[PDB]
Amino acid sequence: QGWQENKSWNAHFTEHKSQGVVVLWNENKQQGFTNNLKRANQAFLPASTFKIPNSLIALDLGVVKDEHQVFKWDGQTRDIATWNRDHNLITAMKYSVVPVYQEFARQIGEARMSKMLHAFDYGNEDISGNVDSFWLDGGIRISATEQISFLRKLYHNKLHVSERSQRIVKQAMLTEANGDYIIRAKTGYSTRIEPKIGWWVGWVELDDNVWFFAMNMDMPTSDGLGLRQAITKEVLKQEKIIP
Numbered sequence: 001q002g003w004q005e006n007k008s009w010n011a012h013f014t015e016h017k018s019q020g021v022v023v024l025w026n027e028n029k030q031q032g033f034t035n036n037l038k039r040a041n042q043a044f045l046p047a048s049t050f051k052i053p054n055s056l057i058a059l060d061l062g063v064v065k066d067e068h069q070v071f072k073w074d075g076q077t078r079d080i081a082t083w084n085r086d087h088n089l090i091t092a093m094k095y096s097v098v099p100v101y102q103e104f105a106r107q108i109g110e111a112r113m114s115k116m117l118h119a120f121d122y123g124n125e126d127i128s129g130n131v132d133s134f135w136l137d138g139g140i141r142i143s144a145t146e147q148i149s150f151l152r153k154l155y156h157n158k159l160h161v162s163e164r165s166q167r168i169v170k171q172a173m174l175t176e177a178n179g180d181y182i183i184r185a186k187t188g189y190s191t192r193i194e195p196k197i198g199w200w201v202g203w204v205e206l207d208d209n210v211w212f213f214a215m216n217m218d219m220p221t222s223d224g225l226g227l228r229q230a231i232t233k234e235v236l237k238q239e240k241i242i243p
Ligand SMILES: *C(=O)[C@H]([C@@H](C)O)[C@H]1C[C@@H](SCC/N=C/N)C(C(=O)O)=N1
Pocket: 046, 047, 048, 049, 080, 096, 098, 136, 187, 188, 189, 190, 222, 223, 225
């Protein structure tokens, strides 16, 4: 089997009248768990979770000099208000500012974007579509288990980019931390192509172990976005990963 199936986590999806998959990886024991082995291997558009490889590539090619470089707002008012201001790599990740990352992809270019995604072993490695939207409405597809594989390489500094690039991106992935755990992660909301889904991918660092996770769920409207982190934390608590 490889992966173990734990159907009891479906209770957390059903409790919120939702459908989806959570995948966990225990790094110390090299064991994986999921509520749905089939959906765990189903490949979707990455949407904003593609900000992780896009950040790595932009840094390594010097499109982004460091996490303090300011990317000026282009003056075009967009629907998410946090986008209509200047950003650096830290705040553009936090607020998931698409137009900044679309400019990164334009500067990287089709040829180099394709070779890096092949170097990364990322999903189906297919960038067909527009250079600045293929991860939103083009041909790239990645499963939850494939996100884990990619994230594990990032955690260990094993992707073929500089160690510094990988350290900066993991810094920008910082989402939450207390005296018990650190979460580094990235959210995604795929809306341009059916089915609309939400993503949350990353890992939980403990004193003696790290737990990688990748989840996606059906997201017909934006009012459910909070359930990405809420369902994931319910699974993490049930498995006694976080208190
Ligand atoms: C990437 O996944 C998304 C981009 C492609 O639009 C961004 C946008 C936010 S959600 C939009 C604000 N919702 C309000 N209700 C996002 C996310 O939260 O994952 N990623």
